Structure 1
Amino acid sequence: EDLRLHLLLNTSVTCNDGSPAGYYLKESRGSRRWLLFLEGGWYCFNRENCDSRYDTMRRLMSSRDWPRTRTGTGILSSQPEENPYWWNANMVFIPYCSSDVWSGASSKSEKNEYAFMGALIIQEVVRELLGRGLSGAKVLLLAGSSAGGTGVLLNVDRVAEQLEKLGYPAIQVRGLADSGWFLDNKQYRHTDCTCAPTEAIRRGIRYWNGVVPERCRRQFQEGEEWNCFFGYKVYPTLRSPVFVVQWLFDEAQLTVDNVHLTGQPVQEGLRLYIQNLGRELRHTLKDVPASFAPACLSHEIIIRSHWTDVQVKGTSLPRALHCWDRSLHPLKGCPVHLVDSCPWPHCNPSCPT
C-alpha cells in the first residue's frame, strides 16, 4: 500500500525553497495504466504571503522534511475494496511544493526569493518515470485535488504533448480534475485581498510567471491569462479527455466567497446566494460530458478512503470513472455525466459527514 519517495534527479527542478521536488511511486508490474496525482493546498501570491506559508506550511514549500513513504488512499489505493476503479495501476503521488497551482516555470535566483516550478515539476516527473515503466503505458491519468485539480486542467495537454514530442504517441493522456472547478463570482460579503477568487490569480500568475494551456492563452491573450485558471473557461480549449469531479458547494469556493455556515438559521440573502452558486456551477457543467458533481458542502474526494460512498443518481464515483474508461474505447446503465439537480447542500443523502 506504500508509495516510495524519489527526489528528482534533475535537481534544477525544485520546491519553493530550492530543495529538489519529487514524487511517490508504487509500481504495478502487471499494469499498463499510470495514475499521476497532483496534491493540492492553496497557493501564495507575493513575498510576504509566501513567507507566512514558509513558517507554518513548510512541507508545501520544501522537500526537506518529507517522509520516505506515503500510504496510497482512495484512488491511489491498491486494494480493490477501497479502489474499485484502478486498484491495479501504477500509482504516483506528486507532492505540491511550488504554491503556484502547478503553473510556474520560474527558478529561484538572485531576483526571486522563491522558485515556482509546478509546471516543470510535472514534466520532469513524467520524464523521469518513462525509465521506470511509463514508456510501456497505454493510459496516463493525470489526476489532482483542489489546487491539484486546477493543475490537471492547466497541465494535461502539456503532458500529452511532451509525450508526443518524445516519441510516445501510444500513451493516452487523460485528466481527472477533482475540486478544482472554481467560479470567478462576486463574494457574498466584500473583503480586502480570503482574497476574491479573481484578483488572487491575477497577482499569483504574475508573481509565479505562471503558464497556461496554449489555446486558452491565445484566446485571452497577454495580461488576461488568469482566465485560464477557471475550469469553465479553460476546459473548452483542451484536447485531452478530462473528467471533472466537483462538489456543487465546494468549501474552498465558499471560503473565497466569504460564506461561513456557522450554524444559525441561514437568512434569505445567503440562501439565495448559495442556491445561485449551485445553479451556476451546474450550468457550467452542462456541456462537460464526463463529470460527477454532487450537491454537497465538502472539499476534495478522490484520495479519501471513503470516496466510494458518494453517489449521484445511484452511481458512485468509481463506477462513473469505469464508465468513462469504457466510453474511451451511450452505454446502457453506465453513465458518465452525473450532476445533481437538487439545490441545497446535502440534498443528496450520500454526501460526506
Structure 2
Amino acid sequence: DLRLHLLLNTSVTCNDGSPAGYYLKESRGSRRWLLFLEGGWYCFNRENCDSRYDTMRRLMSSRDWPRTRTGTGILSSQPEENPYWWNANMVFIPYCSSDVWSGASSKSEKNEYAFMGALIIQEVVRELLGRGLSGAKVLLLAGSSAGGTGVLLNVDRVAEQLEKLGYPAIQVRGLADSGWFLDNKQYRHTDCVDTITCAPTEAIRRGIRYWNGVVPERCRRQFQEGEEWNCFFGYKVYPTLRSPVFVVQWLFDEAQLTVDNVHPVQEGLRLYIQNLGRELRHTLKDVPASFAPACLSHEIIIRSHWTDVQVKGTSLPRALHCWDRSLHTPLKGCPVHLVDSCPWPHCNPSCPT
C-alpha cells in the first residue's frame, strides 16, 4: 500500500486551500520512480466549481483523503499485475486542483479557489528528492485522462526543474494515458454551460483564464497570447516536447465522445465515429511510442486488468518495456508504435468489456 504525505509546504493547496499531497510506497532496491497524476475533468468558473465542491469534494480538497491507497495496474508492486515496473518507487498524486494540472494561482481575497496543479507537481518532486528521488535513474511522470493531459503539460517542466536543481542524471519521461484529445466539431452542437457537454476548445479557453493556467514554453511561443488553450491538445503540444513521451489512447475514448455529444447506429453517426478514429490515428502516425487500440473505453493504466488488451499481438506492459529498451534503431520483436487500423469500436477483440 501507498502512504499519504500532505505537502510540507502548506501554501501549495487543493482548490479549497487544504494542503495538497501525495501517496508514496518506497522501493529502496530501485532507482525507478513512477509519479502518477490522477484524472477527473475540471471546473472553469465559480458556479461549476461550487457544484463540484458540493458532490465531488475529494477532487477539490484533501480534508477527507484516506491515510493509505492500494497501488493498482501500473502502480501495483505485484509482478503478475504489473509486469512492467512492479519493483519501482510508486507515487500517486491526487488531483485536487480541477485545472488539468496547469494552474499556478493561489487562493486570495479575490480568488474563491486555488488552482495550483502545476505547482503541486513541482512541490511533490521537490519533497521526493529528500526521500530517495535524488538517486533516481528514471522518473516516469504518468497520468490518466486529465492527468494524461497533465503529463503533456508538465513533463518538460519537471525535466527542467531537476536540471536547474542540479540533478542532470535523472531521466524524466512521460506516459500520457487517455489524455490525447481532439478539438473537433461535436456530433451535435450543444451549448457550453456545464463541463461534460461543453466543447473542448471553449472549455480550455475559459479554464486557462480562471486558473491562470500555464503551458509548455515552446508550445506557448508557437500559439502566442490568448491561444494557449491549443497546448492542451496532445497533437499540438506533443511535437514541441523534449522529454520522451509514450502515448496511450483509446481510439474511441468515452470522454472524447462525451464532449462530442455522442451517446441502432445510423449512417450519420457511423460516419462521425469512423472519422473520429481515423483522425485520432492520423495524429498518432508520427508519435513513435504509442499504444492506441480500437476500443470504446475510458482510461487504462491503473486498472487491475490493464495487461489484457493487445495491439498487433503486443500488450501495453510489453510495449512499455520495449520503450524502456529503446531509450538505453527498431528492436526485433519489441515493437513500440502500436496503433490499431481497424475503423470501429471493438474491431480489436482484446478490447475490455
TM-score category of the 2 structures, normalised to the smaller one: over 0.9
Return the alpha-carbon distance in structure 2 between the equivalents of residues 103 and 203 of structure 1.
Answer: 13
1:184-233 deviation digits (Å, cap 9, x = unpaired): 00000010101001100000011000000000000000000000000000
**Structure 2 match to 1:348:** 348
| SS of aligned partner of 1:34 | strand
1:157 is displaced (CA, Å) by 0.1
Return the alpha-carbon distance in structure 1 between the equivalents of residues 158 and 77 of structure 2.
Answer: 24
TM-score, scaled relative to structure 2:
0.98
Return the alpha-carbon distance in structure 1 between the equivalents of residues 19 and 302 of structure 2.
Answer: 24
Return the alpha-carbon distance in structure 2 between the equivalents of residues 5 and 253 of structure 1.
Answer: 32
1:53 is displaced (CA, Å) by 0.2
| SS of aligned partner of 1:41 | coil
Q: Percent identity?
A: 100
| SS of aligned partner of 1:244 | strand
Return the alpha-carbon distance in structure 2 between the equivalents of residues 163 and 75 of structure 1.
Answer: 24
TM-score, scaled relative to structure 1:
0.98
Return the alpha-carbon distance in structure 1 between the equivalents of residues 323 and 184 of structure 2.
Answer: 30
1:114-149 deviation digits (Å, cap 9, x = unpaired): 000000000000000000000000000000000000
Return the alpha-carbon distance in structure 1 between the equivalents of residues 121 and 352 of structure 2.
Answer: 31
1:18 is displaced (CA, Å) by 0.1
Return the alpha-carbon distance in structure 2 between the equivalents of residues 19 and 207 of structure 1.
Answer: 19
Return the alpha-carbon distance in structure 2 between the equivalents of residues 174 and 257 of structure 1.
Answer: 30
**Structure 2 match to 1:238:** 241
**Structure 2 match to 1:46:** 45
Return the alpha-carbon distance in structure 2 between the equivalents of residues 105 and 305 of structure 1.
Answer: 33
**Structure 1 match to 2:23:** 24
| SS of aligned partner of 1:4 | strand
1:20-77 deviation digits (Å, cap 9, x = unpaired): 0000000001000000000000000000000000000000000000000000000000
Return the alpha-carbon distance in structure 2 between the equivalents of residues 29 and 187 of structure 1.
Answer: 48
1:88 is displaced (CA, Å) by 0.2
1:288 is displaced (CA, Å) by 0.1
1:350 is displaced (CA, Å) by 0.3
**Structure 1 match to 2:320:** 321
2:214 to 211, 215, 220: 211
**Structure 2 match to 1:202:** 205
1:291-323 deviation digits (Å, cap 9, x = unpaired): 000000000000000000000000000000000
Return the alpha-carbon distance in structure 2 between the equivalents of residues 7 and 172 of structure 1.
Answer: 26
Which ranges in structure 2 are unaligned for 5 or more consecutive residues? Answer: none
Return the alpha-carbon distance in structure 2 between the equivalents of residues 197 and 168 of structure 1.
Answer: 37
1:282 is displaced (CA, Å) by 0.1
1:2-29 deviation digits (Å, cap 9, x = unpaired): 0000000000000000000000000001
| SS of aligned partner of 2:5 | strand
Return the alpha-carbon distance in structure 2 between the equivalents of residues 298 and 352 of structure 1.
Answer: 8
1:327 is displaced (CA, Å) by 0.1
1:249 is displaced (CA, Å) by 0.1
1:271 is displaced (CA, Å) by 0.1
Return the alpha-carbon distance in structure 1 between the equivalents of residues 43 and 115 of structure 2.
Answer: 10
1:259 is displaced (CA, Å) by 0.1
Return the alpha-carbon distance in structure 1 between the equivalents of residues 38 and 256 of structure 2.
Answer: 18
| SS of aligned partner of 1:295 | coil
Return the alpha-carbon distance in structure 2 between the equivalents of residues 67 and 31 of structure 1.
Answer: 26
**1:303-342 pair list within 5 angstroms:** 303-329=302-328, 330-342=330-342
**Structure 1 match to 2:291:** 292
**Structure 1 match to 2:74:** 75
Return the alpha-carbon distance in structure 2 between the equivalents of residues 69 and 190 of structure 1.
Answer: 43
1:331 is displaced (CA, Å) by 0.2
Which ranges in structure 1 are unaligned for 5 or more consecutive residues? Answer: none
| SS of aligned partner of 2:121 | helix
1:341 is displaced (CA, Å) by 0.1
**Structure 2 match to 1:57:** 56
1:283 is displaced (CA, Å) by 0.1
How many pairs are equivalent?
Answer: 348
Structure 1's consecutive aligned runs of 4 or more residues displaced over 6 angstroms after TM superposition are: none
CA RMSD of superposed structures (Å): 0.2
| SS of aligned partner of 1:143 | strand
